[PDB]
């Protein structure tokens, strides 16, 4: 029982350390896709503004 308890504690500690390391590691693709999402939202807003402004100008002309 002493051996089993020590081995299980060591395994738990090692697995926790590895999980923490991997969690710390993984932040890259999230950041890149965050940048992509921000750029696409900016493009969406720009094109909505273009729609509004051009429609208003043409309506005034007509």
């Amino acid at each position: 029982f002493k051996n089993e308890k020590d081995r299980l504690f060591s395994i738990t500690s090692d697995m926790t350390r590895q999980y923490k390391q991997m969690q710390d590691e993984l932040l890259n693709q999230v950041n890149d896709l965050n940048k992509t999402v921000i750029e696409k939202d900016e493009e969406i807003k720009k094109k909505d503004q273009q729609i509004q402004d051009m429609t208003k100008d043409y309506e005034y002309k007509l």
Partner: protein
């Protein structure tokens, strides 16, 4: 099984070594103490072999029966050593009554 078994049990190893050294000293210096019964005891194989080897110094000791879980080859060696030192069975002198 245990990465730190020796680190944890160094104290037990030291105590066993001290006990075995004392046993060896007593067996060697026991001119009169020649009968020992260490049976039914959890004497490690290494400790039992050390005790058997120390026995060779003192041939006065005529008997030692040790734990049964000692290696069987060492048990046979101990039996041979004890047979080499068994005291002679003094023939009881029958007094012829008259």
């Amino acid at each position: 099984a245990n990465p730190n078994f020796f680190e944890t049990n160094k104290d037990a190893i030291e105590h066993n070594k001290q006990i075995i050294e004392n046993i060896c000293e007593v067996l060697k210096a026991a001119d009169t103490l020649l009968y020992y019964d260490f049976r039914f005891n959890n004497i490690s194989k290494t400790d039992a072999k050390a005790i058997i080897d120390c026995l060779e110094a003192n041939k006065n000791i005529y008997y030692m029966e040790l734990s049964e879980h000692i290696p069987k080859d060492l048990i046979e060696r101990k039996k041979g050593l004890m047979k080499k030192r068994k005291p002679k069975k003094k023939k009881k002198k029958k007094a012829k009554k008259k």
